[PDB]
């Protein structure tokens, strides 16, 4: 009854979760759905217990009564005394990234260009840049701004999915899961690296982790950081070292959500599971690492050091922050 049912989004996450379930001696077991929204429905129905979510998905889940349990914490700079599990999270930087060779593309000349998004409804990929664009254009027709896009989750016949590529067989175009070649932070950055799009909306860490040999994956292995620039809201372009002064927003960290009635038990099982399979886990890398997936960010971001306790038993609006919840609410007025 202490068994926790994780929800895997698509078949790559399902494989990873089945490995975790075998290694955990079924203390964790797996349900799978094709999209994050479908996993949120399985948790609402009580057919799964928990999954990790981007902050835009935490807004969907929290409007439905699910609660944040633990947050991803990556490597920090201040508070190094404090154990990872007890350290306040820092947010991550939402950025707009372009190629250096695409000279004279700036924030102010994005109209009619090609865009790459992590997925509809996600923080850096969609809520932050589209919220900003709707506000600045004074128009809700955000499906007409870029000439073509990959925005997984949108209608596959629309311009918002025109650049999406589907799976190895070219099926599942635009699905919001890792089967879509251009899904998520890594897929939207690959869409820009391959010059399918002109801009990608990702986070600062994705640029660094997929350049300069930080990834050995085939499409990333030869990318150089200096070949990219960030688009700043004042119309300037900066090197990717300057994200602290050239971002679109600071996003709340991805976090595990559950029904309120199972939160305490999900929390206790995850704190034990990361002791085993987390960053310096007893059985990681020997048997299984919960926070690696060959850069694919399956079930958790690969840069995750631990899942950390939340201060103040926060509601989902307190965890997201009032600035971000208000930004989302305004954007969702459009559709």
């Amino acid at each position: 009854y202490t068994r926790v049912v994780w929800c895997a989004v698509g078949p790559e996450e399902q494989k990873k979760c089945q490995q975790w379930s075998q290694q955990s001696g079924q203390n964790v077991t797996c349900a799978t759905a094709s999209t994050t929204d479908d996993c949120i429905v399985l948790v609402l129905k009580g057919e799964a217990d928990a999954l990790n979510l981007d902050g835009g998905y935490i807004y969907t889940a929290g409007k439905c009564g699910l609660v944040p349990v633990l947050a991803e914490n990556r490597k920090s700079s201040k508070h190094s005394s404090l154990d990872c599990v007890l350290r306040p999270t820092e947010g991550y930087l939402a950025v707009a990234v372009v190629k250096k060779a695409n000279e004279g593309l700036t924030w102010n000349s994005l109209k009619d260009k090609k865009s790459c998004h992590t997925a509809v409804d996600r923080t850096a990929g969609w809520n932050i840049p589209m919220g900003l664009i709707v506000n600045q254009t004074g128009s809700c027709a955000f499906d007409e701004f870029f000439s073509q896009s990959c925005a997984p989750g949108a209608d596959p016949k629309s311009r918002l999915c025109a650049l999406c590529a589907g799976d190895d067989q070219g099926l599942d175009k635009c699905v919001p899961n890792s089967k879509e070649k251009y899904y998520g932070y890594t897929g939207a950055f690959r869409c820009l690296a391959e010059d399918v799009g002109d801009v990608a909306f990702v986070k600062n860490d994705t640029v660094w982790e997929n350049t300069n040999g930080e990834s050995t994956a085939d499409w990333a292995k030869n990318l150089k950081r200096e070949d990219f620039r960030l688009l700043c809201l004042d119309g300037t372009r900066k090197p990717v070292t300057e994200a602290q002064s050239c971002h679109l927003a600071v996003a709340p960290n991805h976090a595990v959500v559950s029904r309120s009635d199972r939160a305490a038990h999900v929390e206790q099982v995850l704190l034990h599971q990361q002791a085993l399979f987390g960053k310096n886990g007893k059985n990681c890398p020997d048997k299984f690492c919960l926070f690696k997936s060959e850069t694919k960010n399956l079930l958790f971001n690969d840069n995750t050091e631990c899942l950390a306790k939340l201060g103040g038993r926060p509601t989902y609006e307190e965890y997201l922050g009032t600035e971000y919840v208000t930004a989302i609410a305004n954007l969702k007025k459009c559709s």
């Binding site: 929204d37 409007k63 439905c64 609410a329």
Partner: peptide, 6 residues
């Protein structure tokens, strides 16, 4: 403001 999407 107020409704779960499902």
């Amino acid at each position: 403001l107020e409704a779960c999407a499902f």
